[PDB]
Structure 1
Amino acid sequence: SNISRQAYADMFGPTVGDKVRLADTELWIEVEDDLTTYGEEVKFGGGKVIRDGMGQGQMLAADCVDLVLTNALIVDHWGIVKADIGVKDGRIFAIGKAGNPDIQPNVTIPIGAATEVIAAEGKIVTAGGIDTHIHWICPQQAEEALVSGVTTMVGGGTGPAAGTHATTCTPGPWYISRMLQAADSLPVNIGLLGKGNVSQPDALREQVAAGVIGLKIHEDWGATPAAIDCALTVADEMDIQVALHSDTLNESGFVEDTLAAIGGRTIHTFHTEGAGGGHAPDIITACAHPNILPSSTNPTLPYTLNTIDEHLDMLMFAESRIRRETIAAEDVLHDLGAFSLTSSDSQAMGRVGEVILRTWQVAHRMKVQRGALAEETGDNDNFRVKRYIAKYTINPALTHGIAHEVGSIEVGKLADLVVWSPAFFGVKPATVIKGGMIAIAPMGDINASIPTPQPVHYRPMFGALGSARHHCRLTFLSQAAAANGVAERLNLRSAIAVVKGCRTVQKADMVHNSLQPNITVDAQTYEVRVDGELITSEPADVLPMAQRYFLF
């Protein structure tokens, strides 16, 4: 028969050409494609399509998926498309048309008796976020982050210790082992960073051999040219990544010195703007280099009216570090693609549950201030949406060598997915899936007749329990630890994943964020210029994804 577009959207979600506003921002996305056959969409419920002999077939478990997300609107770095998602064995099986081949056409995702269903019509589905700047100050951070849509956390720490408060470092074999064991209790994928500040290579190899997937060089432990060179030498031979928080005091040299010490070798620069740490006042110039993978921490994102005021006491010379000129420019550099990742810097000048939220706030503020990106096609912000989502998903995954397991909705990757209602996109998820099982979601009155009655607040699900958790999360290890049998020795219960490809990623590899601007910072005025033109922006007085959604 026929059906009007409005009623169709109400029943199966939007289709090609329809636009959807992201939360309460000014960003609009438009469906680029729909992988269905009109009339053959699958729907669950009394009298619907997914019933024996109809939308559900007769195949055995081996020939059908374990889970199907129906009528999902995917937003990923590669596209904004409408499709069914199939999950099998904890991984993304396919993106296409679900159903029963016996009576339906174009079925690429077979639904059988062994298939569970999540109705995603009217919902936006994304990969789980990846935060690579975690300070393990307390375990409660994993729940906060998971609830926000972040499924992988990389960083270092031992708890509320002075070392960890300041640096993302898990110092030495003993603490590393202890933290690898504690990680099986947390519902997120975890990778650890050791202390890279030493001029003795063997002291670094021990930590890698013990289990760390990276090394953090921090000025508090001494970000000297010697220590930097030593860490990068070990990284080169052990295929682990290096994260840097440079010498703010310019004690051992200026920025050009650090860059020289690095010597064109791959390195992830933390909070490249400078407020969070780094050569004052020009550490931001690092984003011009091909070997530097630049990221921002979240408190400076985006530039608002109270930003500067709150930053002094949070620091606790401050004026050399907290610069309005570089803070204003950072937002633009993100819009242009010069800054490739966003991260938190949890409880050490960063908010753990605000990585995703703040990234969208920057995109919004840039659309309002600068208009459409030169790359936009059509009357939508599709490209700007792909550029920004890549910042907390695929790019972080590439920078740390875990893109082979997580980072995006592509076949064969771990099924770490987040379901969002368009009105709450980037703010409060409808469902957070880890390794194919729901791990946390909003849940109403436990004793109620339905799951919707108040009070509704996030509560841990079966995917966050005992052995089911162990089966749905990954603990990342360096290739060395993996070979030395660390997992068996510490008796780790979770699935193991090895990092690789940390030395070969370069700026050009960052999805939609590969710009290397000819950037300069004025030593006196602190003004940031690209090709001589001044880069700057205005501070927001009010932002979306804020007072309309939070109780406090």
Structure 2
Amino acid sequence: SNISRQAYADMFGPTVGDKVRLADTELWIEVEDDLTTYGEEVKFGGGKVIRDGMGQGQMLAADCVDLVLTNALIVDHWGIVKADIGVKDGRIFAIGKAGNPDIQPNVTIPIGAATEVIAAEGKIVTAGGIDTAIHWICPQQAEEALVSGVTTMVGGGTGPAAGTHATTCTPGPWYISRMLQAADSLPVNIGLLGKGNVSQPDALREQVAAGVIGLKIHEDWGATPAAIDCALTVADEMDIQVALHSDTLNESGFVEDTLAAIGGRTIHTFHTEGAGGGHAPDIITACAHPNILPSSTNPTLPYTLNTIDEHLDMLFAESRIRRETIAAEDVLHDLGAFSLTSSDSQAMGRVGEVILRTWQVAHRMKVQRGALAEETGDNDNFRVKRYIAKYTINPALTHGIAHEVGSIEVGKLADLVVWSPAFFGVKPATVIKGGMIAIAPMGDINASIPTPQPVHYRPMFGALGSARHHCRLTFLSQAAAANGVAERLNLRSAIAVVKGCRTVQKADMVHNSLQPNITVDAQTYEVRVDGELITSEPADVLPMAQRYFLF
């Protein structure tokens, strides 16, 4: 028959040409494509489509998916499309049209007796976030981050010890081993960073062989040219990434001396703007280099009225906390010069606010700068793809784990986050880890339905014992994997190895590969790209704030 577009959207979610507002921001996404065959959409329920002989077929488990997310509006770096998502063996099987080939046309995702269903009509589905600036100060950070939509956490620490409070470093074999063991208890994928500050290669090789997937060079442990060179030499031979928090004091030299020590080798610069640490006042100039993968920590995102007052106290202080570089950082993100966003958890950063803040920056930039030169059509699709890549695929590429996670592509681990449009980026409807729901808002346990109050996030089956081990990954360096570290420490979770950390360059950062001719004035701190001043205005009120939180 025929159906009106409005009634259609109400029943199956929006289709090609319909626009959706992201939470309470000014960002609008438009459905670019819809992989369905009108009239053949699968819907679950009494008298609905997914029933024996109808939308559900006669195939054995091996010939059908374990889970299908029906009528999902996918938002990812590659597109904003409407489709069914098939998950098999904890991995993304296909993005297409689900159903029963026996009676339906164009079926690419077969549903059978072995198939569970998650109704995603009217919802937005995204890959899980990846935070790469974690200070393991306490294990509670994992639940907080998972609830926000982050499913992979890379960082270092041993608990609430002075070294960890300050740096993302897990010092030495003993602590590395203890933390790899502790990781089996957390519901997020984890990779650890060791202490890279040493001028003796063997002291670094040991940590890599113990299991770390990267080495953190932090100024508090001495970010000297000698230390930097040593860590990069070992990284080049062991295929692990190096993360940097440079010499703010300019003790061993200026930014150009650090850049010189790096010598064109691949490196991930943390909080590239500088308030979070780094050569004062020009560490921000690192984003001009092809071998630098630059990220921001979240307290400075986006520039608001209280930012400075807050930072100055949170923290010579005036040489590090500069209104000039903080205002410019938002714009550099909008332009693609900065490629990742991270937290810097409980050490000048908020663990549950990586996603939320990334979207507030996009909103503030749309409001201030209008449409991006790359936009096409009357929507913010390109700006949305540029920003979502900052906490998904780009962090995955920087740390050599993009072969496992980072986006919604076939064969990748099924770490997915389901959002209702009104709460997008703020409070998820469902967080899936490796094919099983791990945490979700849950109402009264004794109620007749799962919706009665009070509704708050509670751990689900994917976060329990052995089911959790099967649905999470512990990333190891190739050396540790070869040495049998997993068998020796008796690790229970699935193991993944990092690779390709040395070959990534700025040009590889999805939708964020700009290398601007940027300069910072030594006296005024003004940031200029090609001579033009880069700046922005502080927000008085932001979306995704007081309308959603109780405190």
Tell me the residue number matched to 2:74.
Answer: 74
Tell me the residue number matched to 1:546.
Answer: 545
Distance 2:125 2:253 in 1: 47
Distance 2:401 2:313 in 1: 36
Distance 1:258 1:234 in 2: 17
Q: Secondary structure at the match of 1:118?
A: strand
CA shift for structure 1 position 481: 0.1
CA shift for structure 1 position 487: 0.1
Superposed CA offset, 1:336-361 (max 9, x none):
00000000000000000000000000
Superposed CA offset, 1:108-142 (max 9, x none):
00000000000000000000000000000000000
How many percent of aligned residue pairs carry the same amino acid?
100
CA shift for structure 1 position 401: 0.1
Q: Are 1:229 and 2:200 an aligned pair?
A: no
Moved over 2 A (4+): none
Distance 2:335 2:496 in 1: 33
Distance 2:303 2:167 in 1: 25
Superposed CA offset, 1:439-498 (max 9, x none):
000000000000000000000000000000000000000000000000000000000000
Distance 2:496 2:26 in 1: 39
CA shift for structure 1 position 508: 0.1
Distance 1:313 1:500 in 2: 40
Superposed CA offset, 1:8-29 (max 9, x none):
0000000000000000000000
Distance 1:462 1:396 in 2: 27
Q: Secondary structure at the match of 1:26?
A: coil
CA shift for structure 1 position 528: 0.1
Distance 1:497 1:193 in 2: 15
Distance 1:352 1:47 in 2: 44
Distance 1:204 1:276 in 2: 25
Distance 1:158 1:461 in 2: 27
Q: Secondary structure at the match of 2:390?
A: helix
Distance 2:481 2:33 in 1: 42
Distance 1:459 1:18 in 2: 34
Q: Secondary structure at the match of 1:482?
A: helix
Distance 1:166 1:490 in 2: 27
Tell me the residue number matched to 1:339.
Answer: 338
Q: Secondary structure at the match of 2:396?
A: helix
Distance 1:484 1:4 in 2: 62
Distance 1:287 1:166 in 2: 24
Superposed CA offset, 1:379-437 (max 9, x none):
00000000000000000000000000000000000000000000000000000000000
CA shift for structure 1 position 374: 0.3
CA shift for structure 1 position 314: 1.2
Superposed CA offset, 1:35-69 (max 9, x none):
00000000000000000000000000000000000
Superposed CA offset, 1:293-334 (max 9, x none):
00000000000000000002211x100000000000000000
Distance 1:301 1:4 in 2: 42
Superposed CA offset, 1:63-122 (max 9, x none):
000000000000000000000000000000000000000000000000000000000000
Distance 1:358 1:251 in 2: 33
Distance 2:335 2:366 in 1: 12
Distance 1:20 1:47 in 2: 29
Q: Secondary structure at the match of 2:175?
A: helix
Superposed CA offset, 1:155-211 (max 9, x none):
000000000000000000000000000000000000000000000000000000000
Superposed CA offset, 1:253-288 (max 9, x none):
000000000000000000000000000000000000
Q: Secondary structure at the match of 1:191?
A: strand
Q: Secondary structure at the match of 2:154?
A: strand
Q: Secondary structure at the match of 2:413?
A: coil
Tell me the residue number matched to 1:260.
Answer: 260
Q: Secondary structure at the match of 1:388?
A: helix
Distance 2:255 2:343 in 1: 24
Considering only aligned residues, what root-mean-square deviation do their CA atoms show, in Å? 0.2
Tell me the residue number matched to 1:36.
Answer: 36
Distance 1:547 1:232 in 2: 44
Distance 2:5 2:181 in 1: 53
Distance 1:494 1:150 in 2: 18
Distance 1:318 1:193 in 2: 28
Distance 2:230 2:434 in 1: 37
Tell me the residue number matched to 1:394.
Answer: 393
Q: Secondary structure at the match of 2:134?
A: strand
Distance 1:402 1:377 in 2: 32
Q: Secondary structure at the match of 1:391?
A: coil
- Counterparts in 2 of 1:343-358, with a 5 A limit? 343-358=342-357
Tell me the residue number matched to 1:485.
Answer: 484
- Counterparts in 2 of 1:105-504, with a 5 A limit? 105-315=105-315, 317-504=316-503
Distance 2:359 2:38 in 1: 33
Q: Which runs of 5+ in 2 are unaligned?
A: none
Distance 1:189 1:78 in 2: 23
Q: Secondary structure at the match of 1:418?
A: strand
Q: Secondary structure at the match of 1:275?
A: coil
Q: Which runs of 5+ in 1 are unaligned?
A: none
Q: Secondary structure at the match of 1:392?
A: coil
The count of residues paired between Structure 1 and Structure 2 equals 551
Q: Secondary structure at the match of 2:3?
A: strand
Superposed CA offset, 1:499-552 (max 9, x none):
000000000000000000000000000000000000000000000000000000
Distance 1:15 1:304 in 2: 36
Distance 2:76 2:314 in 1: 34
Distance 2:328 2:506 in 1: 19
Distance 1:297 1:167 in 2: 13
Distance 2:242 2:463 in 1: 30
Distance 1:84 1:502 in 2: 33
Distance 2:177 2:320 in 1: 35
Distance 1:366 1:297 in 2: 18
Distance 1:161 1:215 in 2: 19
Q: Secondary structure at the match of 1:2?
A: coil
User: How does the TM-score come out when normalised to structure 1?
Assistant: 1.00
Distance 1:289 1:366 in 2: 24
